[PDB]
Ligand SMILES: NC(=O)C1=CN([C@@H]2O[C@H](COP(=O)(O)OP(=O)(O)OC[C@H]3O[C@@H](n4cnc5c(N)ncnc54)[C@@H](OP(=O)(O)O)[C@@H]3O)[C@@H](O)[C@H]2O)C=CC1
């Protein structure tokens with residue numbers, strides 16, 4: 467199994483969601499970036515795994531579920547089986563990560579991408595080990611009801627460059643944003 471990563475888009479006020487959707491209007495190229503980063507596998511014969519909470523799963527339009535070309539794993543203690551369209555179900559992040567070591571997935575999974583929501587990000591971000599955060603900074607305030615956890619910059623280093631990630635300011639629908647990559651190893 468390859469690297470462990472989180473990927474998020476966040477507003478200036480740390481918002482990541484409102485009422486089960488994104489706080490800002492659709493940013494088509496930003497979605498394309500998410501698709502590209504989570505799908506592209508560094509290893510022949512493997513796919514990336516996406517891990518998400520139950521609310522995050524149901525926030526994805528049905529037509530985009532499961533995220534194509536990726537193994538889709540949902541976290542829930544209430545559900546008894548994976549939701550329609552999903553591939554795997556685990557009752558904790560630790561369980562999900564342990565699952566990727568089992569014979570059914572050990573040789574199938576390259577990168578793992580945690581795609582939300584808040585509690586899943588928080589657990590991942592405070593878990594000892596090597597972790598990257600792929601963070602899109604949406605450069606305005608948007609009304610939100612779910613927030614990204616604090617990034618401890620003592621541990622997470624903002625990388626000065628990363629291959630395949632544009633370094634300059636992007637703009638869609640009059641909204642400026644920029645891509646960042648953070649890395650910790652503890
Ligand atoms: N801007 C961005 O990049 C992103 C934005 N979002 C937005 O965030 C909004 C809300 O996400 P959020 O409210 O944080 O919800 P989550 O997706 O984390 O879902 C919360 C629910 O997921 C299960 N769950 C979460 N963590 C675990 C765990 N560690 N172990 C077992 N089960 C778990 C549910 O458990 P159970 O069934 O047991 O009660 C829990 O009630 C979404 O609607 C989405 O629009 C989401 C991802 C990215």
Ligand SMILES: COc1ccc(OCCCCC(=O)O)cc1Cc1cnc(N)nc1N
Pocket residue numbers: 473474475496497498499500501502518522526530533534581582600601602
């Ligand atoms: C749960 O996070 C997301 C899941 C899907 C999504 O739609 C993107 C469409 C891409 C099509 C595909 O991948 O097949 C958007 C999000 C939110 C999200 C957005 N942007 C970034 N950088 N990270 C996210 N988690």
